[PDB]
Design a protein around this motif. Structure first.
Motif, PDB file in Angstrom:
ATOM      1  N   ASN A   1     100.085  65.543  83.054  1.00 41.81           N
ATOM      2  CA  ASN A   1     100.480  64.620  81.986  1.00 41.81           C
ATOM      3  C   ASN A   1     101.918  64.843  81.514  1.00 41.81           C
ATOM      4  O   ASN A   1     102.530  63.928  80.981  1.00 41.81           O
ATOM      5  N   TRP A   2     102.428  66.064  81.692  1.00 45.25           N
ATOM      6  CA  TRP A   2     103.760  66.456  81.215  1.00 45.25           C
ATOM      7  C   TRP A   2     104.718  66.857  82.332  1.00 45.25           C
ATOM      8  O   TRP A   2     105.924  66.620  82.218  1.00 45.25           O
ATOM      9  N   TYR A   3     104.198  67.422  83.422  1.00 45.06           N
ATOM     10  CA  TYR A   3     105.043  68.009  84.467  1.00 45.06           C
ATOM     11  C   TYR A   3     104.779  67.431  85.863  1.00 45.06           C
ATOM     12  O   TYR A   3     103.764  66.785  86.092  1.00 45.06           O
TER      13      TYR A   3
ATOM     14  N   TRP B   1     108.368  70.522  91.545  1.00 47.95           N
ATOM     15  CA  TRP B   1     109.791  70.712  91.840  1.00 47.95           C
ATOM     16  C   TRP B   1     110.028  71.900  92.763  1.00 47.95           C
ATOM     17  O   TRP B   1     109.195  72.793  92.905  1.00 47.95           O
TER      18      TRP B   1
ATOM     19  N   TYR C   1     115.367  75.903  87.823  1.00 48.47           N
ATOM     20  CA  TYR C   1     114.474  74.855  87.306  1.00 48.47           C
ATOM     21  C   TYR C   1     115.194  73.843  86.405  1.00 48.47           C
ATOM     22  O   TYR C   1     114.975  72.637  86.529  1.00 48.47           O
ATOM     23  N   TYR C   2     116.046  74.331  85.505  1.00 49.32           N
ATOM     24  CA  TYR C   2     116.670  73.477  84.498  1.00 49.32           C
ATOM     25  C   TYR C   2     118.109  73.065  84.789  1.00 49.32           C
ATOM     26  O   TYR C   2     118.534  71.999  84.333  1.00 49.32           O
TER      27      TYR C   2
HETATM   28  C1  HXG Z   1     102.977  60.869  77.233  1.00 51.00           C
HETATM   29  C2  HXG Z   1     103.543  61.545  78.463  1.00 51.00           C
HETATM   30  C3  HXG Z   1     105.005  61.881  78.195  1.00 51.00           C
HETATM   31  C4  HXG Z   1     105.746  62.191  79.513  1.00 51.00           C
HETATM   32  C5  HXG Z   1     106.456  63.565  79.448  1.00 51.00           C
HETATM   33  C6  HXG Z   1     107.898  63.535  80.001  1.00 51.00           C
HETATM   34  O1  HXG Z   1     108.563  62.504  79.930  1.00 51.00           O
HETATM   35  O2  HXG Z   1     108.392  64.721  80.522  1.00 51.00           O
HETATM   36  C7  HXG Z   1     108.069  65.897  79.728  1.00 51.00           C
HETATM   37  C8  HXG Z   1     109.073  67.064  79.879  1.00 51.00           C
HETATM   38  C9  HXG Z   1     108.725  67.996  81.035  1.00 51.00           C
HETATM   39  O3  HXG Z   1     109.807  67.880  81.964  1.00 51.00           O
HETATM   40  P1  HXG Z   1     110.591  69.172  82.667  1.00 51.00           P
HETATM   41  O4  HXG Z   1     109.738  69.609  83.944  1.00 51.00           O
HETATM   42  O5  HXG Z   1     110.813  70.311  81.723  1.00 51.00           O
HETATM   43  O6  HXG Z   1     111.958  68.467  83.244  1.00 51.00           O
HETATM   44  C10 HXG Z   1     111.958  68.110  84.593  1.00 51.00           C
HETATM   45  C11 HXG Z   1     113.410  67.968  85.005  1.00 51.00           C
HETATM   46  N1  HXG Z   1     113.938  69.316  85.389  1.00 51.00           N
HETATM   47  C12 HXG Z   1     113.123  69.942  86.462  1.00 51.00           C
HETATM   48  C13 HXG Z   1     115.303  69.141  85.927  1.00 51.00           C
HETATM   49  C14 HXG Z   1     113.997  70.226  84.217  1.00 51.00           C
HETATM   50  O7  HXG Z   1     109.036  67.805  78.649  1.00 51.00           O
HETATM   51  C15 HXG Z   1     107.972  68.663  78.476  1.00 51.00           C
HETATM   52  O8  HXG Z   1     106.846  68.479  78.933  1.00 51.00           O
HETATM   53  C16 HXG Z   1     108.313  69.947  77.753  1.00 51.00           C
HETATM   54  C17 HXG Z   1     107.115  70.449  76.951  1.00 51.00           C
HETATM   55  C18 HXG Z   1     106.331  69.274  76.369  1.00 51.00           C
HETATM   56  C19 HXG Z   1     105.532  69.914  75.247  1.00 51.00           C
HETATM   57  C20 HXG Z   1     104.451  68.890  74.873  1.00 51.00           C
END
Ligand code: HXG
Ligand code: HXG
Ligand code: HXG
Length: 177
Positions: free
Chosen positions: A109-111, A114, A135-136
């Motif tokens: 749902n969130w991730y 990669w 990762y970031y």
């Molecule tokens: C209702 C679903 C919302 C969709 C979530 C979204 O757009 O991406 C979420 C993003 C996750 O994306 P991330 O893997 O950190 O960014 C991918 C891009 N890179 C790999 C370059 C960092 O942020 C988080 O999940 C951080 C913790 C959320 C706490 C509830």
């Protein structure tokens, strides 16, 4: 053709990684990793850092030019539901470090999936900071069922593929640029 072992690089493909993947059993999140060393130089294992999950397997110690290493990981068995997310670090015989990121998260749902590949100047252990950079901050590739190519510098380049599912394969070839 088991994880922990080296095979001839030209024999690396989806079939070998699927067999490694299937051997881990019915677990929600797991990865088969194959890295084909065509770099022209021998690799010596340093360590693996697991941000999430674990492996029962030792990194193949020595990986010569023309060989591919086979590795795997899975989510924590214990009470905390995790994915499998980490960084493999190898010392190349030029003094430099080849680092590979994989991320197969628990909560889709969130991730999403990669991966990344980078050469670090000098001798660097895989750790939390290295995971965060890859990762970031160093433009990781999606596990999107497609191939991505990128120069690594040091006269090397990577071509890699990662699928999009929680049962993940990661196949990487390190070649001369
Ligand atoms: C209702 C679903 C919302 C969709 C979530 C979204 O757009 O991406 C979420 C993003 C996750 O994306 P991330 O893997 O950190 O960014 C991918 C891009 N890179 C790999 C370059 C960092 O942020 C988080 O999940 C951080 C913790 C959320 C706490 C509830
Ligand atoms: C408040 C963050 C919620 C994001 C969804 C999630 O599953 O948390 C990530 C983590 C494990 O998920 P994982 O996919 O391994 O890590 C997220 C992937 N990364 C680290 C790459 C961003 O969950 C935990 O074990 C924290 C404690 C859970 C309740 C006790
Ligand atoms: C009280 C603040 C809530 C936000 C917690 C946070 O910053 O954790 C981010 C972390 C993302 O982990 P990571 O990729 O390792 O990056 C965190 C380290 N920083 C913030 C330096 C990038 O999310 C997780 O999956 C941890 C599980 C939290 C639920 C208890």
């Amino acid at each position: 053709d088991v994880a922990g072992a080296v095979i001839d690089g030209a024999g690396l493909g989806f079939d070998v990684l699927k067999t490694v993947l299937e051997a881990l059993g019915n677990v929600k999140r797991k990865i088969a990793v194959g890295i084909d060393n065509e770099s022209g130089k021998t690799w010596t294992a340093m360590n693996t850092y697991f941000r999430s999950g674990t492996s029962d397997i030792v990194l193949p110690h020595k990986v010569a030019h023309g060989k591919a290493l086979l590795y795997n990981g899975q989510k924590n068995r214990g009470p905390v539901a995790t994915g499998v997310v980490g960084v493999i670090a190898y010392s190349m015989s030029d003094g430099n470090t080849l680092a590979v990121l994989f991320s197969v998260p628990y909560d889709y749902n969130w991730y999403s999936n990669w991966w990344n590949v980078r050469v670090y100047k000098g001798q660097k252990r895989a750790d939390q900071r290295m995971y965060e950079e890859l990762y970031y901050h160093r433009s990781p590739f999606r596990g999107d069922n497609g191939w991505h190519s990128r120069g690594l510098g040091y006269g090397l380049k990577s071509r890699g593929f990662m699928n999009s599912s929680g049962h993940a394969i990661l196949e990487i070839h390190v070649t001369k640029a």
